[PDB]
Amino acid sequence: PAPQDVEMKEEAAAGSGSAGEGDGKAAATEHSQRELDTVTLEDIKEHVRQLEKAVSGKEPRFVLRALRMLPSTSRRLNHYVLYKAVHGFFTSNNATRDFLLPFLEEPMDTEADLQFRPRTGKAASAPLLPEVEAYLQLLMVIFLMNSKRYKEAQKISDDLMQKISTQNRRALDLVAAKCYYYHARVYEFLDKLDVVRSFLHARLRTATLRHDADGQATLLNLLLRNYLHYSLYDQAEKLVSKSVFPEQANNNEWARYLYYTGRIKAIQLEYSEARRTMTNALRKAPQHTAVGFKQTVHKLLIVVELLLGEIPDRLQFRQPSLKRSLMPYFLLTQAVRTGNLAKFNQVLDQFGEKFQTDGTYTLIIRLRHNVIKTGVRMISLSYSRISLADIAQKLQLDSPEDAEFIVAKAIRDGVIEASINHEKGYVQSKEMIDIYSTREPQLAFHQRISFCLDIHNMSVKAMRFPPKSYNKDLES
């Protein structure tokens, strides 16, 4: 309802714009500016703004709020997100979102925070013209997470974004970083087959020379992510060896990077680092982006744990309240703790179709071997001698002969620590349950202490961290 649309827009445009411009302009306060802009602003634009009041688009006023390019060609993108093709799956404005130049009414009022059109328009060797361009470009493509829109204003958005960029600056890469994430997503996330790649690589080259960490970080994640979805995995594996993640990247950037890296090492046969990277991503960044990811992360995570050699408990399923999403997985877990082969194959097959989706399919075969490995550890540990035939029946192996061969391999790996006596008709337990006997109580301390060293370093550094900014702000 246009008479009601105008209050909503004016407030929204001013509030979001004010925070991006007041922060950017200071230009030498790089750490604060980088953090505020990446996490807070983009997140504000997604979750609070859109949802607030009647009609999710508050875009038409906004285009005029700052400046993109002076003819109404670049503006046109603002109309296209509103209506063309699909029209997204957001609530669009009735009118006053005009094809060419959305709005007739400025909210600019010659501010430094809401700009002025000819005033920004002079800039092209100043950071004032590239920053404004980007903020508006970002806002327009911000609807894409929520909507999962295709071929509206995202047809020329890739090209238009390259135009905004030039040889950039360290301040300009920090604002531009927000745009880089959406640039891949429009063809990536939908999985239209197109080249998002050219641009992504190209910004990457430029940002490394200037050495702006925010920019490089975003590109590397997308490049891995794009490949895996396209089903061109080979490309993603080779990429990692050439990558370097900055150590001064922000918390969202790290979470996305870590999840994506985690799926890759899991394929290689490295479960140990794969589980840790996926868990930490969820706490590191609670984002509204994060909501789409979480179901996949837990689903993939469980199959990934079973392979490492831990069998997860029931409780873990219960707490994140996503138990239902987890539910077909939960059955696979109950099957490993019992250790019986026969149950695993049936369950995993019917369910298997769903599993293909997460990225689990490659792994799925290997989960067969964990079930038996858990059965072998229980047989050797519990008793001394039980007949080979009793074991054959219990796990539901095909033959009593089949039990021998599997037991024989397991000992070599050395996880079991038993002896199988083939001729005598039994397994002998060579192991005894202990952790104080050999050199081993020291190892037991080692692992306990080891997890701690990391926690200590983090607690202490983190404590100091707000005071580091106050110290810089000039307080003792």
């Binding site: 408990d313 029931r314 109950q334 703790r337 019992t338």
Partner: peptide, 24 residues
């Protein structure tokens, strides 16, 4: 872990009675 309780109550009473006859 697995739900041992549902299974043990039914098994313990019934099996034990047959076991009495079978063995000491």
């Amino acid at each position: 872990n697995v739900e041992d309780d549902f299974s043990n109550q039914l098994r313990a009473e019934l099996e034990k009675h047959g076991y009495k006859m079978e063995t000491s």
